[model samples]
Target chain A: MTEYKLVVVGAGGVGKSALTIQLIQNHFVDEYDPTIEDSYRKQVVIDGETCLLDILDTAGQEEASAMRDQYMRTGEGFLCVFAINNTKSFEDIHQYREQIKRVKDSDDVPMVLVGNKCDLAARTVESRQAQDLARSYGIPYIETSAKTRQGVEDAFYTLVREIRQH
Target chain B: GQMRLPSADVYRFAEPDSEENIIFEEGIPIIKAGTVIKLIERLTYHMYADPNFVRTFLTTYRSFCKPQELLSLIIERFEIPEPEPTEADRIAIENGDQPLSAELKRFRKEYIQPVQLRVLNVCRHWVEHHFYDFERDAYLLQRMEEFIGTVRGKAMKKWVESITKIIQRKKIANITFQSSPPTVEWHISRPGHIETFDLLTLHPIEIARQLTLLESDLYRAVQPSELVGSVWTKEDKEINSPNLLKMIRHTTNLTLWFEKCIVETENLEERVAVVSRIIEILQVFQELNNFNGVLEVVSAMNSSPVYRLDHTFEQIPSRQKKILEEAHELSEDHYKKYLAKLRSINPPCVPFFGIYLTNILKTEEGNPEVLKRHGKELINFSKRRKVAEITGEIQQYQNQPYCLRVESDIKRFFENLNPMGNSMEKEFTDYLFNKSLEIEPRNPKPLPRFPKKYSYPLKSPGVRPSNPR
Candidate 1:
């Protein structure tokens, strides 16, 4: 079985888990307990190619230091999730990048900047100016909506394409 | 006293011969001799008896009667006339003239003094009370600092020496003291016989037996009064119990004084220290107040850009869903209340709940055409029930600076979410790269303004009609 590893990380409450669930299950999880201490995984085939997506849905803060240590020991691909409605999450991607580097021991990684909650564009906090941030970091950027299932499959497929090309 | 009638106008009354001819006959006007004498007597009596009548008779005689009659009347009356004010009277009036400034001063003295006195009395009473308590609290707080310092430094030799010296200096009577006392000992009693062991090195069995006796004694000494006093003094500052009240008052005074020094000081550095102390106090009082204030402070702290931007994003759908649920519950409750009120009124008036439901349905439908048709009516209905007023308030809230920022942010968020902008693929790779380059490194310049023209064409007719020749 072909497998693809993807990790989604962002500030707390920016819909990382929602996007992950949406991409795999094709439906938004209505009630998400952010306090739940667990990660979810699922497999799916894209473009007539069977691929297993290993998703590490980590805790927000309580286990941040520990999670960072674990990532340092075994870091792979990245999907930086941020809420379009939360500018703080978008701006803090730099710190997240730094954390990834500290843990992964490399500045270069196949990363996708996922701006989640695109459905709530009316309440957006981050602007196009955030694209400059992703560009500077050399990361691909896209906005996705879990509820609407928008850009759900494309975000991961793009990442896989980047990895395969490399 | 005898009465006589006029004899046919003195035996012959004549008419006027011409327009300007005399209306009366000549030679005493053919008057009846007794009548003429009686008229003269009546005129003389009025002219001399009353001064007012005399003046009036003279005036009337001069104006309407003949001048000779007026002169005769005046002479008969012999009336006196008063002259105008002399020079001295004029000077006195000028000297006693009231100035506008003096009048205003007099008015103020009469009207404002009593009110000012009452206000000052009340203010003075309040100030006195406040200052008295403030001073008492200050003094008690100073003493408390001394007590805490002493207790905290009790283990220090320097503190001991200082206390000893102070005690010796204050001594007025002879006192004897030995060296520092040894540590306390526990006497153990078994069921059959009592056993004694070295306090420092008691076996577990011996210690357990001793602790058992101690526990029994502790239970025996646990009085209800002591427990009540302790709790009242420590927790509630009981005013009903004098001892508890004294303890509480003293502690409060001490605590308030310390708070003043640490928390309320004006110095910036001191203020920071005071803030930390306040946080500490909040931590202690968290359980008492359900930590609501602490949570607010924590939330505010978390809202800071440094904290919020540094943290990972978590999903908050549950929170949003909860808020939506609460709003639905509140709306339902309001509808029920309106319905209840409507049912009570006579003549079966239309229930306000129906109008509310209609408005809500209209809102939920969110069709611009439907809203344009009945929006005003629905809004008016809501206004009558005060529901529309709150909704209007929420709409106006968007005009607030914070809300405007959020709105602007939401607009940008949608723009970023546009699927066509996905620049990851190779066909659009150049566009993506160029776009990324365009966005890199905070542009010192402002972001470009939005283009006025739409990307899509508009379907509109031209001004002139086309013709074929």
Candidate 2:
């Protein structure tokens, strides 16, 4: 089967599942529960090109940190999501980047830094200053709302484009 | 001769008078010497130098005057200037010979002026309203050209032609001033009409609202089946996420309300307002962005009866037998109606129970006795062609409120029991358990395993009974 690997890593309750549902089903879940397992697989086609996307929905806490390594082993690309409303999730992205370097076989694998939960920015903990963090990491970043479905497709499309370029 | 004290006959010779002129002593007196001298001088002057006078007099009295007489008066003459009117000073002369009534002037001002204004206003309004309708815009532009050409003279035609060309090329018509004033002066003058300007500014807002409402309504129309595993994206975050399959149930419910709004409304303005809002909301969703929502909205608007429901149910293997029984009952009722309709005709028609029998037989593997009993009843019903009895039974079942509930339960049961096979001796021992409790209670069952010896006939059955023949 033709395959394309994508891993989604974020802190818990940051709407990782909500974003996943919107991508896979083009809809949103108001009250979402986290995936019990470390990985889920979905088949998708981008711009008429068929690809089997192995989606790695990694655990948020430290205890399940080992699964992050397993996810990176199977991934051809990584999407590190930060909740735009959660400052900790934004900061936790640093640890996610460290884990990615350890697990990634190639230094050139494309990575997309996503700032999610833009819909809840009224009570946001993270600000737009996260752009500097993304710039330091040398990755493209965007703010998204999984609940409102804003910037979701663009983020993925940009990541795909970056992957193709490299 | 005068110094000689000439006679009367000599004086007459000086005047060249005839004998008939002497008869003037009878009734009329003779003229004084001064008047006589003046008359002589005028005659001498005209005869010697003025040919025009000679020509005029000869032309008037040509029939009387002899040719020799006309030649004797011939002399040099100056040309007279011809009369002509000054263009700068010319004005339309209204003869007071026929005066118009006060009422007529009032009527002209009241009726004609207002009519012209109304026509102009309507044309402007039409252009403003259909600015986006390129064909209408072109037609109106042509008419505007004609109107300007008619009233403003051909000198203005060149400018009109240029404006028309610009409009036709760009497919838009905008008004601008012609002359420049002295000094660097930029004055903002509102168009003669403000309503059209207001309407034009509102166009973008209306369009945005339309897109929003359309998207929202579309989101509401999606069926649960269509939404499962569909892709979603966030604008702020670059990520692909899947929706919980169970959420499809609730999502579609809200969408149906939007569908009703699209269907029930007839006013274009109101419909556009509502649909625009819905579309505006939906356009934000890059994930579930598909044409399915559009099609569903249209179908609903057209009052199509077909509708699909999306829902999630708790999975339980223990309900398999009950579900199959309900399915059998539903199938029987469906078949009974068909058979009754067929029998009610003047001449009896052959009942096609193949569909019912196949569905019944498909579920037969769960319990042989239940299948056998249902199958026998079906066979008997088919043979007897009990039209009235079957019709009555169907009506009775349909009247019950619990029928639909049972049917729904049966459908859910089959969906849950789909993975099991008849090869396993353990009926419900190896059912799958829920891995997550967040969305819905669903447990997929593992394939049943049978003993080695019994697996051959049960797992790999080569032949089955033919229900078609």
Candidate 3:
């Protein structure tokens, strides 16, 4: 059995929780409820072997930068979530990535830049933009539709494998 | 809201064949057979999980890949290491084994992931299934999660330890209290009766417990208490909107203080004695309408880690135990019991804010916030009505005085207590081990070199030789 802590971080409304619920359970929560320090862990068989994935919260920036910093440093891998339809969120991608790089102090932290809500065709950030950003950082760019469960598992599976590599 | 589930009618949203799935790593999709084999290879590597499934999988894909190669992959994919060879493996190729490693890996899986099966000098495996789980004779998802966590890092240290803790966690009376319970300044007497304890008066904690319920104006005022955002989570309804945070702080403090009392004590009898005081304080908390205080205390008590010490609990005479049990009952019966009890109570009772909010979530959750023609653009009036009703009941307690009083030091204990100060486990386990040692009979022939059966600083009034630590 192996354990990996996969942290999902993003500016609010980028569907981080939705992405999580979608990936782990293949379900979507329509009525929005922001997370508060919550933990969702389970034994998932990845690559035909048992593994534990713990999803923990990074206190919102409003709480304290140091708190957020502590979270990034502790986690093994990250899911940098962004809503494809929200430019405001997409715009923060660089800052969040840099923060992860700075806080975790690694230029190549195990991470996947996820453009969520692919089902919403009215996109503010194009797939090319998100993909280019990931490429510049040497990470994978996964376009996912939490609604359709597309690219959800791969985003996590890839991220965990990357963490193992790192 | 019963929001959409992705697994539900998955086909309603078409897959449209993803290029991501189509493009197999290190394979040429242009070479159609290569793409087919890649997918087939991935399936062979992962698809066959059980012995029965292996047979079915082989039959389905027999023509695509060599049967021997596929069988070998299955073995490699599901390799299980020898359970007894932690030492031999320490040097037997440090990386140990990989999945699908050709061997009898199924036996290892049988040992770890068994249906009617599940440690040594460890927390007896049966204890986890019987005492901790109370349901089945097997490991749980949580146990698996922990097992994986341990094995992932310093694989050996974590492997034995994770299982060690899981089993020991059940059998050991020493508790690893995660959070605290709901409190106030007050005195409880007959504390010495060790059984028939009685409350003498109330001691107010900084704020009255009743105020804690109304404080959730944060929990109520906000919609979707959890909003997806750059903002604090679930503050969709909470976070500094009201002093609900402040009230919860007190509950945490109370809860922390309770665990510290148990953890800091030097011995089981002394530890149980400390817990007794917490039981007394709970009555004061219950009186002040501090549901958080009461609830946290019950949770701390319910923490199986510490409570598993049967001797300490057995030592508590039923009369004194009653004090703990009566306060504990508030948590039982779906807490609807507590709600029902609260409904019948007169003025000045503080309600459990957590439970109060849960009831609201349940009520409004059942009926939608918008009722046609019932405007605020359709304020959830039914929700509002329920809130008002619960609030009205809470309001009555607001006027009531929390007569409980504690000196600054007593109150401060909870306000700054450290339950996980690192010293907790060593001290607790030491005490538990020492107490557990007492279980063995010291003299089969009732033989003690020291006849008086004791030696202490004060000539030891009433010191049993067998009892001397």
Candidate 4:
């Protein structure tokens, strides 16, 4: 069977685990402890072909630069997530993009800059700003609300298709 | 119990009754599977009956302790047909002709000493495993050797002593054959998409050694001569149909091995290295003079599965690219520049075996096996002459022995290779395309990943904790 590895990276409480769980477990989780969570496996049928997609939650160790670099090196595709409601989280997404390229030593890393928690209307980070950032990085950008489940699957599937392209 | 003659083709010892511990010239005995034949018949069982028994016996013979490889090495050695003994051979042995006498020694080292050494090993194995009374059969083995060895004529002794014993328990220390397993190896072991060569450089000759073995060892081992089947028929494949099958597997080994290497790769970069090594081996094979290696390399590289990977081919350099192109030209079906090149090469050269076979087959396709002229029947002289030339070319290499001693474990290398047997197009393509993307720089803008307006609001989750980074 064809297989792929996806890495989900973000600060604590940005809904990184929730987005991954919605994709793999299909259950919206609102809470997380700040440690590496369980890995997920889903048999996804994409474009008429069955593939095993493996998701790794980076476990909120955003401070351990070395660990983040290691994850970047191993990832086939990356999801750098920030809650759309938080400006600080939104502004921090570019570091993930830079780190991935630095560790992989290539600009064409398969990635998607994700703005999570998009269901809330009381927002600070705007879609236009996130879109502008993703364009600068040359990777797909998506707004995903774990509660509403908008673009959670799209975030993953797009990255997988991107990985497939590479 | 019935005692059959030692097989018809083999040298059934002159004294047929030696198993009874007596020498008597008599008819062949017919021994069925279960017979109270002498313990010496068990000796025959080890040598002539069960291959597993022979395999096991020979395997442990060195530990008993004898030079074990000589058993198969005997087969390896004799695969080359011994040149017909000529009057010049006698004086050449005395006058020591530069190559002729050397060829003589080659045939000797190839077959003769191996025969004696194998005989000694087999006798030793039987002594250790079966023939030990542990000393009565030992006595018989002892007596058998005394009667044979010092049997005077050189060729006669090789033929005779092999059946009897100069086989012994003399553990003359230090100089035993190095104990090793028969496993496939390569210069690169355990390759992946992310490759790092701990060794400074890969050895092309190491890979060619396997092809060398296929031609000089297994090819000759499994290669038996075509036999006359019916009255007046020059060749018959029908006799020992099973033996014919075993012979067919001789070529089959290369196919299986090639396929195994092809499929066994895990990722695209590793597969590239594997194919590169294969191509290198073929080029090295040119130096060794073996068409089986040449053709297999071409078929491997030009095969549609490998050829379609235009992405992978881009990484292969111009020198190899040139070599690969030449391989295609030489292996083409139509008679091209091949015959001219073959004629130009010295004794140590390999010509495409299939071309000659095809040429002969085409020549015979329209012609009769035996021609009739003026009521006096004649042999197929043209076919004979063609066959003679091919065999002569083959025979020329008989004496030019390959002496290879690899420092690395060849099995680890080949085992690391993909028996790239399975075909899954998507998986293969994704791997190839993806890994190739990593080998060199990629455009920061390969394709524009445009933004789609969001249906939901990008709301702030609340007062955010201080930035972690």
Candidate 5:
């Protein structure tokens, strides 16, 4: 089966694991487990094409920050995640995108700017600004709530779609 | 009820015994769909039939059975009952002609003491290797003590006492073998009056030695269970693999620190010197057989932000350039050459963990957790065997300590090299890239010295490179 090498990258405590567990296991994980590195495999029918989604969930902490380039180089697409309530996380999205571009050495690499934790009442990074940023980068921006299971599939499916186009 | 013996007259223990307790299929022993008692029988009797069968059973048995269940089964097996006496046998015993019949004697010799002794030996292996199980289950611990009390032998007495003391320690101290990592003076003690340490001040060999020492500390702290079942990649990774995560964090930190040191310097000549010095240090890493350090340095240097500065790279001496190119080769074919080197070399070295992580993930993803064969669902012990083997090798290297001395000042400096807080990692990277462009912009003309180029005095005064040609 064709495997899409998708990587989830974002700042620490931004619900990367929550979103992944929700997508793969179909349940939201309330407790945070600071990810070192994790790989998951799932079979899905995306646009009537059955393919394997080999997802690599990476550490958002700077301790494992040196691994970005290697992870970036191999990943077919990226879910550049950030928490909606965390303005800093949203602000940090550009850096992840830049590194992806730098490591892939191509501006048109497959990516999705994921605004995670949209279930929160507070919104520091407005959807309008997020759309503008995604527009600037020419990638899709999807608001997801790992807690609500909203846009979880869309976030991953969108990245797979981007990888397919690439 | 067929018994195959060397001599046709030999006897079988159980009548109508059609159970395939010890069956060798696919070059490995397979006890197909047996009861717990039957499984324990194979474990005690045929333990030596396959060398690691006991270990495999002991390590993976927890998935299907509990410690108390196994202990009770073993105790049941130890109390083997005597076979019934027939009419002639009864007459012989009554007349006191012979003490016992051939069948009774053979059963005693073959099944009674041997199975009992091996059962105890299995317990010994269990307690010694995995005391955490006993630590968690009090009933199992008490029952083991009671069973060992009735046993009598010179070696058994010694083992019993040793096992008792181990359990005593566990009970008294609550030691789980997962105790917090020890704080060694050499590794953890910080030196007073930290200074802005320059990469050139220390010899490259010393730098490489410290890097290996630092990495070894992180690597050695990783427990075996962390890598088992790819738990580091699972939901409870925080509990399962904190030390493994810690080691990874240090690896990232080291690479970023090196990158920051190089690009943060503004002068082209100085930046080139820093890059060359880093290459020299990486050469030492190669010599020390520190694959983790070697890869981190290589990854940092090859990162696009750093690699895009063509002018700086052009200024590097050919000798250093050759080393960088060799690093690329070392990392080629998905680190084929590096893995070869890792396997061939002796330990007291930190192997590149990323390759092992990927290998483990692939092995886990490719294999099923449980294998169904011939209407029997067996816990896929083979998968665990491979995972344990990889993690065991990781521990092998971790156990062999480096003989180098830890310079506390330099170690402290390395520990605190987070110039930008983690939240600003993106900003810091962006800042470095923009600095890189300003230093050597695209489509460069002849050298026009930019007096406005930002330069900071990050390091104390140090002697110039003596061998800079």
Candidate 6:
């Protein structure tokens, strides 16, 4: 089976864990544990192709920066997650995207820019800005709510497609 | 209803969705939202079949249900009424045969007795791992004490004794580990001669040995509770997880040291040799089964500044290059090879900390600390157990101290390794990148065999006096 190493990178509390758990377990986890470094594997059939996705859920805190290089090097695709309600989280996406590229030593690594917490009514980062950011990076933009399980599978499946194409 | 069966192999082919298939799936059934009584029953059934579920339930039950309530349910489950003796039972007794009816015998063996034993086992697990629950509540302790008096069986004897010991330990609360003050009589010497007292001066085995000792010490010092709650990322982590931070700090330090050792070299030949030596040290670490040391050295070599030095790498010996390639394989496939190596190897080894830390963090994140079921908030003890399982692996290694003797001088060298020197993180990284560019201006000169035979004499730098000396 083609194992895709998908890394979820974002600022702290952007619901990276929630999105991952939602995809794997089909339930939203309310807990917030700043991931030190965690990986999951799911035998997902995306676009009618059977493949195992080795999803690496990473720590968003700045303290975890030291170990970022190693995971980034190994990850085949990146899920650059950001919180829609938090502008700072959205802003941090540029750094994550850039860092992934630098570590991979490629201008275009397979990636998806994800705006999480779309269920929250209060908006800080609009869909237009998110789409614009993804456009600049030449990647897909996806809005998801780990709480409501909206677009959780699409975000991960799209990244898998991105990797397959790459 | 219980006798009804489906295709037994269905779950083997696909993920289990229904409760019946879930039990047969050979995995912990995800019990999301359930009534207190239903959760308790699931815990008893799975406590033996899949200890993981029971572990999670036991650790997390306090958030949803009261300690007294959980105890009561367990006791109630254990005291399930025995089936009444049938007509055959009376006839068998009259014949001085086995008194219990066949139905009674099967019911007791398969259902009644097993349920009781499992209920007892659950109590034992709760007491052993979460004794603080009992310590904090006198009523819970008293209830358990009363329940313990009623339990009777040879199997019950061992569990009863084990629980009693843990309870006794909790009662005394004398499980205190007296941490000693770290005695370091040496200070970091001022930087002048980059080559003096450097990584190259030490033998590869010695470097690996010392790194192992230091890393082992850091790993051993981490308390199990420190990993709980992912406290390391908290604002007050220093107060909560100092040992864990120290361990992390050392990893960063060692990683930087690898980069710093090579980048600080003005001579191309010497820089290449340093890189080769660093790779050799990594090989030694692998031999010693020090996966943590291997990863740290590898991390530094993979860092942009060190990795971008194409010209310098071209001069590294073929043997050392192979070693570097081999080291890279350990980190491949999400560390599948490294993890396999770790499991196969004998202990007195330092397994990668990041992997375990990630496991604990994910366990903490994936499971709710407090599950809101049926309008009641229940403590998620399952997450605690999951974290404990990872920490438990760590503690297992903590007990297996390395056989290698510590060279105080080499240990002291590692202790004083501030690879960032006096510069901030970003500044140091920038300097290294600039230095890397200056040394080997990226034309992509590929690897070659030992192009130049390089050797340097042992250079010892001046050391500052420690205290009165």
Best by DockQ, which number? 3
Candidate 4 chain B superposition, TM-score: 0.41
Q: Rank order by lDDT, top first?
A: 6, 5, 4, 3, 2, 1
Give the per-residue lDDT digits (tens) of candidate 2, residues A1-166: 2556677777877877677666655557664433322233344456655444555565464433433454566567778888876778877888878877876756566888898888773746454477778778788887888877788877766777676677
lDDT of 3 by residue, B1-469 (tens): 2212123133111122243223322311221112222333333221111211122222223223443443333333223333333344455556665334323343333322221111111112223312422223234434533433444323133224535555544544511111233333223311223232211122222223322343322223332212111122243435422345555555554555455455444355555555555665565566545565567778777763445545457766686589788877766767756865554443334556666566555654576543333122222223334444444334334433322333344333334544445656568546544433343213442311212211222111111112122
**Candidate 3, residues A44-132: lDDT per residue as tens digits?**
55676656677764423332222355456667898888898889888877888888888777787888999889888698888888888
The regions of model 3 sitting more than 4 angstroms off are: A1-166, B1-239, B286-290, B372-380, B404-410, B421-469
Q: Rank the candidates by TM-score, best first.
A: 5, 6, 4, 3, 2, 1
Backbone collision tally, model 6: 12
lDDT of 4 by residue, B92-189 (tens): 66776633555555545443433443344344444333432224334444454554454454533333443342244321210111123233333333
Model 3's CAPRI class?
Answer: incorrect
Q: How well does each candidate superpose onto the true structure, as a TM-score?
A: 0.26, 0.28, 0.31, 0.33, 0.60, 0.50
Candidate 2: tens digits of C-alpha lDDT, residues B90-205: 33224323443444444333332222222222223223222332352455455454553343334223333434444444553311111221121111213232222211122222
Q: Residue-wise lDDT of candidate 4 within A15-69, one digit each (tens)?
A: 8877776664346655343433234555555766556676777645442233355
* Position B188, candidate 1: lDDT: 32
Q: Which segments of candidate 5 are over 4 A away from where they belong?
A: A1-166, B1-42, B47-51, B61-91, B97-109, B134-155, B170-193, B422-425, B444-469
Return the lDDT, model 6, position B203.
53
TM-score computed on alpha carbons, candidate 1:
0.26
Error of 6 at B392 (Å): 8.0
Off by over 4 Å in 2: A38-48, A123-127, B1-469
- Model 1 alpha-carbon drift over 4 Å, by segment: A35-37, A62-66, B1-469
TM-score of chain A of each: 0.85, 0.86, 0.92, 0.93, 0.97, 0.97
Q: How much does each candidate deviate at the interface, measured as C-alpha RMSD after superposition?
A: 46.2, 45.1, 21.6, 34.1, 22.1, 21.8
Compute fnat per model. 0.00, 0.00, 0.00, 0.00, 0.00, 0.00
State how far residue B205 of model 3 sits from its true place (Å). Answer: 12
Q: DockQ, per-model, please?
A: 0.00, 0.01, 0.03, 0.00, 0.01, 0.01
Which residues of candidate 6, in runs, are more than 4 Å off?
A1-166, B1-36, B45-117, B127-162, B170-198, B217-244, B336-349, B355-401, B406-424, B434-469
| lDDT per residue as tens, model 5, B1-469 | 2212222123232322233322223533565344445556666662132224455576656656777887877776666566676577898989978755766655554555455555665776576556667766777788887877666655235445655665565577601111232222221122453443456555555567777888888877876556756789999998878989988988888787787777777678777768877887888788777888988999898776798878788888898899888877988998888866665564457888887788778877888765555555555555656765566556546645565667787776776666567657788788877766766776745543543232443232222223322
Model 6 chain A: lowest-lDDT 10 consecutive positions: A31-40
Worst 10 residues of 1 chain B by lDDT: B397-406
